[PDB]
């Protein structure tokens, strides 16, 4: 179930469908018992990598290990 | 300065400028002022907002113990046989802190 | 190091294992003992 054409390192179904969550540096399906945990939901694209035109791509931007001076509301893609 | 595999170090193109801002996004700034000297350190912190991060955290007494090389002597803290307690010094906070 | 080497003219050197550049020189230990590294170095700077 990994038919992502662009090689942006994620579930293409979780790209197109309901969402996902970066957790433990890995891509898990969005459970609806995650808001009380403090996690959020992100929605992205599969047909291209840099879905916001940032110089950082999707897996670089969700898992915040890319620049620690970035304000945290700029973490969702 | 940084040493490569060749056994020497190289200092070229390694700016300290693009390591300024990152540290000042994550750290708390603690300064000490004695009678002749002064020391400014940055100690790393732990965000409580987002739950994915795992940074080990401590308290301000343990922070002054870890930042400076501070010896725990009999409950007190000592820095070069100078006592630093919660009562034998003078603390200064800015208004937000 | 044999103790019949002083009369031969050789000396004894003592070094470190937990790091390479045991004096902080730009030349390391095997480069500094066997003097094939810079011939303008004064010979008392051969021991590490």
Short mmCIF file of C-alpha atoms in Angstrom, two decimals:
data_model
loop_
_atom_site.label_atom_id
_atom_site.label_comp_id
_atom_site.label_asym_id
_atom_site.label_seq_id
_atom_site.Cartn_x
_atom_site.Cartn_y
_atom_site.Cartn_z
CA UNK A 1 0.00 0.00 0.00
CA UNK A 2 2.96 2.27 -0.77
CA UNK A 3 2.07 3.46 -4.29
CA UNK A 4 3.49 6.98 -3.90
CA UNK A 5 4.82 8.06 -7.27
CA UNK A 6 6.84 10.96 -5.95
CA UNK A 7 9.39 9.67 -3.49
CA UNK A 8 8.30 11.76 -0.50
CA UNK A 9 8.69 8.88 1.95
CA UNK A 10 5.14 8.34 3.16
CA UNK A 11 1.87 6.47 2.75
CA UNK A 12 0.24 7.75 -0.46
CA UNK A 13 -3.14 6.76 0.92
CA UNK A 14 -2.47 8.85 4.02
CA UNK A 15 -1.45 11.62 1.62
CA UNK A 16 -4.73 11.53 -0.26
CA UNK A 17 -7.21 10.25 2.34
CA UNK A 18 -8.23 11.36 5.88
CA UNK A 19 -4.79 12.12 7.27
CA UNK A 20 -1.88 10.69 9.24
CA UNK A 21 0.47 11.52 12.10
CA UNK A 22 4.23 11.69 12.41
CA UNK A 23 4.99 9.85 15.65
CA UNK A 24 8.20 8.18 16.89
CA UNK A 25 9.72 9.44 13.61
CA UNK A 26 7.35 7.23 11.62
CA UNK A 27 4.08 7.67 9.73
CA UNK A 28 1.09 6.18 11.54
CA UNK A 29 -2.57 6.36 10.55
CA UNK A 30 -4.60 9.12 12.17
CA UNK A 31 -6.59 7.68 15.05
CA UNK A 32 -9.44 9.77 16.42
CA UNK A 33 -8.13 9.17 19.94
CA UNK A 34 -5.09 11.38 19.29
CA UNK A 35 -6.37 14.89 20.00
CA UNK A 36 -6.37 14.22 23.74
CA UNK A 37 -2.83 12.92 23.35
CA UNK A 38 -1.83 16.32 21.97
CA UNK A 39 -1.02 15.22 18.44
CA UNK A 40 -2.68 16.77 15.40
CA UNK A 41 -3.69 15.72 11.89
CA UNK A 42 -1.90 16.73 8.71
CA UNK A 43 -3.17 16.45 5.12
CA UNK A 44 -0.74 16.47 2.21
CA UNK A 45 -0.26 15.68 -1.47
CA UNK A 46 1.18 12.72 -3.34
CA UNK A 47 1.52 13.94 -6.92
CA UNK A 48 4.30 16.32 -5.94
CA UNK A 49 6.81 16.57 -3.13
CA UNK A 50 7.11 20.22 -2.06
CA UNK A 51 3.41 20.71 -1.46
CA UNK A 52 3.77 24.25 -0.15
CA UNK A 53 6.71 25.40 -2.25
CA UNK A 54 8.92 25.54 0.82
CA UNK A 55 12.58 24.64 0.48
CA UNK A 56 11.79 21.88 2.97
CA UNK A 57 9.74 18.92 1.81
CA UNK A 58 6.91 17.08 3.54
CA UNK A 59 8.78 14.56 5.67
CA UNK A 60 11.32 17.24 6.49
CA UNK A 61 8.55 19.58 7.55
CA UNK A 62 6.24 17.38 9.61
CA UNK A 63 8.84 15.69 11.80
CA UNK A 64 10.39 18.86 13.14
CA UNK A 65 14.06 18.01 12.76
CA UNK A 66 14.85 20.65 10.18
CA UNK A 67 15.27 24.09 11.82
CA UNK A 68 14.53 24.77 15.47
CA UNK A 69 13.89 28.49 15.03
CA UNK A 70 10.81 27.75 12.92
CA UNK A 71 7.61 28.74 14.70
CA UNK A 72 5.57 25.66 15.47
CA UNK A 73 2.50 26.65 13.45
CA UNK A 74 4.73 26.34 10.37
CA UNK A 75 5.09 22.62 11.01
CA UNK A 76 1.95 21.48 9.18
CA UNK A 77 2.54 21.20 5.46
CA UNK B 1 37.11 24.22 14.78
CA UNK B 2 36.46 20.65 13.67
CA UNK B 3 38.78 17.74 12.99
CA UNK B 4 38.37 15.61 9.89
CA UNK B 5 39.59 12.07 9.26
CA UNK B 6 43.00 13.47 8.26
CA UNK B 7 43.94 14.17 11.89
CA UNK B 8 44.07 17.96 11.73
CA UNK B 9 41.33 20.54 12.04
CA UNK B 10 40.07 23.03 9.48
CA UNK B 11 38.61 26.47 10.15
CA UNK B 12 37.17 27.71 6.87
CA UNK B 13 33.55 28.23 5.93
CA UNK B 14 32.44 27.16 9.40
CA UNK B 15 30.59 30.21 10.66
CA UNK B 16 29.27 30.58 14.17
CA UNK B 17 26.56 32.91 12.86
CA UNK B 18 24.25 30.19 11.57
CA UNK B 19 24.37 28.45 14.90
CA UNK B 20 23.27 31.51 16.86
CA UNK B 21 19.54 31.60 16.37
CA UNK B 22 18.80 27.90 16.76
CA UNK B 23 20.28 27.89 20.26
CA UNK B 24 18.34 30.98 21.23
CA UNK B 25 15.14 29.26 20.18
CA UNK B 26 15.54 26.32 22.56
CA UNK B 27 17.50 27.52 25.56
CA UNK B 28 17.21 29.44 28.79
CA UNK B 29 19.81 32.11 29.48
CA UNK B 30 21.37 32.09 32.95
CA UNK B 31 24.04 34.59 33.94
CA UNK B 32 26.20 34.77 37.05
CA UNK B 33 27.99 37.86 38.29
CA UNK B 34 30.67 37.60 40.95
CA UNK B 35 32.88 40.36 42.30
CA UNK B 36 35.39 40.26 39.43
CA UNK B 37 34.02 37.94 36.78
CA UNK B 38 30.79 37.21 34.97
CA UNK B 39 29.61 34.12 33.16
CA UNK B 40 26.79 33.72 30.64
CA UNK B 41 25.47 30.27 29.78
CA UNK B 42 22.62 28.77 27.79
CA UNK B 43 21.04 25.57 29.09
CA UNK B 44 18.62 23.49 27.05
CA UNK B 45 14.94 23.31 27.96
CA UNK B 46 11.87 21.13 27.43
CA UNK B 47 8.75 22.30 25.63
CA UNK B 48 5.53 21.16 27.28
CA UNK B 49 3.28 22.10 24.36
CA UNK B 50 4.01 19.37 21.89
CA UNK B 51 4.14 15.76 23.15
CA UNK B 52 6.30 14.16 20.45
CA UNK B 53 9.58 15.58 21.71
CA UNK B 54 11.60 13.78 24.38
CA UNK B 55 14.01 16.16 25.97
CA UNK B 56 15.21 15.35 29.51
CA UNK B 57 14.32 18.20 31.85
CA UNK B 58 15.30 19.46 35.30
CA UNK B 59 14.82 22.30 37.77
CA UNK B 60 16.59 25.62 38.25
CA UNK B 61 18.60 24.41 41.23
CA UNK B 62 19.73 21.41 39.23
CA UNK B 63 20.22 23.75 36.28
CA UNK B 64 22.73 25.90 38.16
CA UNK B 65 24.30 22.68 39.38
CA UNK B 66 24.71 21.40 35.83
CA UNK B 67 25.59 24.59 33.94
CA UNK B 68 28.42 25.76 36.13
CA UNK B 69 30.57 23.06 37.57
CA UNK B 70 28.85 23.17 40.93
CA UNK B 71 29.64 20.86 43.83
CA UNK B 72 26.76 19.79 46.05
CA UNK B 73 28.25 20.18 49.53
CA UNK B 74 25.95 19.08 52.37
CA UNK B 75 22.80 20.41 50.75
CA UNK B 76 24.43 23.70 49.79
CA UNK B 77 25.89 24.40 46.37
CA UNK B 78 29.48 25.57 46.09
CA UNK B 79 31.37 27.08 43.17
CA UNK B 80 35.13 27.41 43.86
CA UNK B 81 34.37 27.32 47.61
CA UNK B 82 31.88 30.17 47.08
CA UNK B 83 28.43 29.40 48.52
CA UNK B 84 25.42 29.72 46.24
CA UNK B 85 22.11 28.98 47.94
CA UNK B 86 18.53 30.01 47.42
CA UNK B 87 19.17 32.49 50.24
CA UNK B 88 22.83 33.54 50.15
CA UNK B 89 22.71 35.22 46.72
CA UNK B 90 20.56 37.85 45.01
CA UNK B 91 18.36 36.79 42.12
CA UNK B 92 17.09 39.08 39.36
CA UNK B 93 14.22 38.28 37.00
CA UNK B 94 12.80 40.23 34.13
CA UNK B 95 9.07 40.76 34.21
CA UNK B 96 7.85 37.97 31.94
CA UNK B 97 10.03 35.40 33.69
CA UNK C 1 62.58 -0.68 24.92
CA UNK C 2 65.59 -2.74 25.92
CA UNK C 3 67.78 -1.41 28.72
CA UNK C 4 70.85 -2.05 26.55
CA UNK C 5 69.89 0.77 24.19
CA UNK C 6 71.31 3.87 25.88
CA UNK C 7 74.84 2.88 24.92
CA UNK C 8 73.58 2.37 21.38
CA UNK C 9 72.49 6.01 21.34
CA UNK C 10 68.75 5.42 21.17
CA UNK C 11 66.35 6.88 23.71
CA UNK C 12 63.01 5.97 25.29
CA UNK C 13 59.70 7.61 24.47
CA UNK C 14 56.44 7.41 26.45
CA UNK C 15 53.12 8.18 24.77
CA UNK C 16 49.35 7.85 25.01
CA UNK C 17 46.84 5.42 23.52
CA UNK C 18 43.46 7.01 24.22
CA UNK C 19 44.17 9.81 21.76
CA UNK C 20 46.41 10.31 18.77
CA UNK C 21 47.88 13.82 18.89
CA UNK C 22 49.28 13.50 22.38
CA UNK C 23 50.95 16.90 22.38
CA UNK C 24 48.47 18.81 20.24
CA UNK C 25 51.02 19.11 17.45
CA UNK C 26 49.82 19.01 13.86
CA UNK C 27 52.03 15.94 13.56
CA UNK C 28 50.92 12.73 15.26
CA UNK C 29 52.94 10.21 17.26
CA UNK C 30 54.28 7.94 14.54
CA UNK C 31 54.92 10.99 12.40
CA UNK C 32 56.83 12.61 15.23
CA UNK C 33 59.00 9.81 16.58
CA UNK C 34 60.36 8.49 13.30
CA UNK C 35 61.77 11.78 12.08
CA UNK C 36 60.55 11.72 8.49
CA UNK C 37 58.23 14.69 8.79
CA UNK C 38 60.20 17.98 8.63
CA UNK C 39 63.98 18.16 8.64
CA UNK C 40 64.18 21.70 10.02
CA UNK C 41 62.66 20.55 13.31
CA UNK C 42 65.17 20.70 16.15
CA UNK C 43 65.92 17.21 17.38
CA UNK C 44 64.72 17.74 20.95
CA UNK C 45 61.24 18.18 19.45
CA UNK C 46 61.29 14.56 18.30
CA UNK C 47 60.00 12.98 21.52
CA UNK C 48 56.23 13.16 21.75
#
